[PDB]
Design a protein around this nucleic acid. Structure first.
Lengths: 50, 123, 50
DNA sequence: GTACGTCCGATCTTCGGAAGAGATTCAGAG
DNA sequence: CTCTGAATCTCTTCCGACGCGCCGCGGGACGTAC
RNA sequence: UCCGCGGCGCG
């Protein structure tokens, strides 16, 4: 929903979904580069928490 | 030091956009605390793909993996406290909390021979 | 009996226990424990009674 | 002074009331 | 001494009226170009 | 522009 002015009144669902899909994108972009196992494990845990 | 181990790179995370700032802060902490033997070098991966058009021009700096820096420190308590003391840095990324987890030597070789080819198509 | 239940027997043991209790999950150090304890109830900056 | 891309470190104080799950314990017997 | 074992203590969750009327603030920070 | 938060008030 847009509010009075040049800004937008966003809902929490948009922010949560954006965070989740960004985390998934980073997950995808790290796997193909043979990233260190510790870092991929940590970011997998952080995606799980998200 | 007291032994002859490989002070291999260790994973430390920072806040995005401050990786160079965190590296400089660590370097100046090492300089002022006068404890330089326990530490080696701070290295952050980066890559350079140059494009002559498309908005951003003549340079494009990215990271192999963001929000993580590598430290040449060694297992002890003084260095652990020193790294914890720097701002904008949370706990280590390893196994158990008190003692972090190192990186495999072969995979360290993989990361370093990936790093040595960054100087491809120079000039 | 309050002292009898207590397993600590030295100032170092008490400092280690309080350091581990205040912030769990970190290697305890006697200097670190002393610094943490002195900064909790005996420092003008973070503690000040009116 | 004004668009714009990326992001997400100062560590919480003051209620019963019940219901339920899990850790503890000592009670007692073989 | 040792094994069950039923009872007890401790830790975690969900719950706490229902219709209005009025007013004010709301993604903020933060560096990075331009 | 229809949403959220907070505050005050009436039954």
């Amino acid at each position: 929903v847009p509010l009075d002015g040049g800004r937008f009144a966003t809902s929490d669902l948009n922010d949560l979904y954006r965070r989740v899909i960004n985390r998934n994108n980073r997950l995808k972009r790290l796997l193909d580069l043979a990233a260190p196992d510790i870092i991929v494990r940590n970011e997998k845990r952080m995606l799980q928490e998200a | 030091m007291s032994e002859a181990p490989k002070k291999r790179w260790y994973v430390v995370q920072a806040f995005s956009g401050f990786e160079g700032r965190v590296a400089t802060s660590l370097r100046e902490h090492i300089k002022l605390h006068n404890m330089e033997d326990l530490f080696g070098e701070v290295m952050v991966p980066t890559e350079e793909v140059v494009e002559i058009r498309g908005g951003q021009r003549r340079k494009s700096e990215r990271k192999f993996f963001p929000g993580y820096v590598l430290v040449q420190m060694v297992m002890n308590d003084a260095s652990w406290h020193l790294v914890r003391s720097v701002p904008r840095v949370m706990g280590f990324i390893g196994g158990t909390s008190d003692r972090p987890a190192p990186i495999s030597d072969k995979e360290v070789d993989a990361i370093m021979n990936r790093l040595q080819q960054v100087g491809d198509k120079p000039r | 009996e309050t002292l009898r239940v207590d397993p600590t027997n030295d100032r170092l043991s008490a400092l280690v226990e309080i350091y581990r209790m205040m912030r769990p999950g970190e290697p305890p150090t006697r200097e670190a424990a002393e610094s943490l304890f002195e900064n909790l109830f005996f420092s003008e900056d973070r503690y000040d009674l009116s």
